[PDB]
Design a binder for these strands. Structure first.
Ligand code: MN
Ligand code: MN
Ligand code: NA
Length: 346
DNA sequence: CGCTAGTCGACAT
DNA sequence: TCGACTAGCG
């Protein structure tokens, strides 16, 4: 997530209700509903005790969407991106830590703080997600498991015209170049909408409303793929991109000390990390629902070599990609754990 | 003013 | 998990 982005472009935000998308299709970052639903039953989940409260929690959101004549496409996270394995491990350590020390806090008597310990140990597994998938598909609601991060898949679904809006809590969608993003939606449909074309309402944003420059801004400020240079936030990065009339971002980053009047040393591997971040935001592998084939988020440009983009995910056979996307194949064991067929009755 | 790093709440009784 | 919020510091 782009920390502070939502407050940085608040002028482009608008309080809405989902009724305005009646008769249209809306994709959903289901992992947020999964997490907020897991919070209610974090105790049983952390203990391994059987529960399915989060299923109902997600399904009342889904039902709420269905009640207003909206077609929801639930999208789920798939395989972990190779550039975040260390990160996921480092987070898993914290989860297990809060789990154990949570159990010890239960041993010592306080539960209100122990609650706060168990709520930070929540690990959304693919099994839970699959439970939600079955629960939704029993209602005729489409479900699609992303090849990797659901962010890029959602971005594709929106930029292709399959859906007209995206329900999420993560601002990464804005960096992926989404047209419309619905944030902070409760059980009743009251949410906050951000339009890409409305980014012009932000005065301090300057002329950084174009998708490319906006992406550059989000990356330079600091994202999940690359940590920002110490002292570089959203405002200063935006200032750099505003003061830079040069289309070549590399020379700009090399002159980031010049555009800001600061003693900023730019390491040579930071440029590599930046290029990788941009290529990940641009060409992360998604799944085409129509053609049923692994494709990059955006079409490969004539300058970039697609052979050196393994950090954006590697390709597999389209059949395997299909069985993975349908949730029929386990992401980890690559074994058939289901046999859904959308044909015999996205 | 801007940025870093840490805290805190979410759900729900 | 992610944003909101804030003390501390350039
Ligand atoms: Mn995500
Ligand atoms: Mn994200
Ligand atoms: Na930053």
């Amino acid at each position: 997530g782009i920390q502070g982005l939502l407050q940085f472009i608040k002028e482009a935000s608008e309080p809405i209700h989902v009724r305005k998308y009646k008769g249209q299709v809306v994709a959903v970052d289901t992992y947020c509903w999964l997490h907020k639903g897991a919070i209610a039953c974090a105790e049983k989940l952390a203990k391994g005790e059987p529960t399915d409260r989060y299923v109902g929690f997600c399904m009342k959101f889904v039902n709420m969407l269905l009640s207003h004549g909206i077609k929801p496409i639930l999208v789920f996270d798939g395989c972990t991106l190779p550039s975040k394995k260390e990160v996921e491990r480092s987070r898993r350590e914290r989860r297990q830590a809060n789990l154990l020390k949570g159990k010890q806090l239960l041993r010592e008597g306080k539960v209100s703080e122990a609650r706060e310990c168990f709520t930070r140990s929540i690990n959304i597994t693919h099994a839970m997600a699959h439970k939600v998938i079955k629960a939704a598909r029993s209602q005729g609601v489409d479900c699609l498991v992303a090849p990797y991060e659901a962010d890029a898949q959602l971005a594709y679904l929106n930029k292709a015209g399959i859906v007209q809006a995206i329900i999420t809590e993560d601002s990464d969608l804005l960096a992926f170049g989404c047209k419309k993003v619905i944030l902070k939606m409760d059980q009743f449909g009251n949410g906050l909408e951000i339009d890409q074309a409305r980014l012009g309402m932000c005065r301090q944003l300057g002329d950084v409303f174009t998708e490319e420059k906006f992406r550059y801004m989000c990356i330079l400020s600091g994202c999940d793929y690359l940590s920002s240079l110490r002292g570089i936030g959203l405002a200063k990065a935006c200032k750099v991109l505003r003061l830079a009339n040069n289309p070549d971002i590399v020379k700009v980053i090399k002159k980031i000390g010049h555009y800001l009047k600061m003693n900023i040393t730019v390491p040579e591997d930071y440029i590599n990390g930046f290029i990788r971040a941009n290529n990940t935001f641009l060409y992360q592998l998604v799944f085409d629902p129509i053609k049923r084939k692994l494709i990059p988020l955006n079409a490969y440009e004539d300058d970039v070599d697609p052979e050196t983009l393994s950090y954006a995910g590697q390709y597999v056979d389209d059949s395997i990609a299909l069985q993975i996307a349908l949730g029929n194949k386990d992401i980890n064991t690559f074994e058939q754990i289901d046999d859904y067929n959308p044909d015999t009755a996205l």
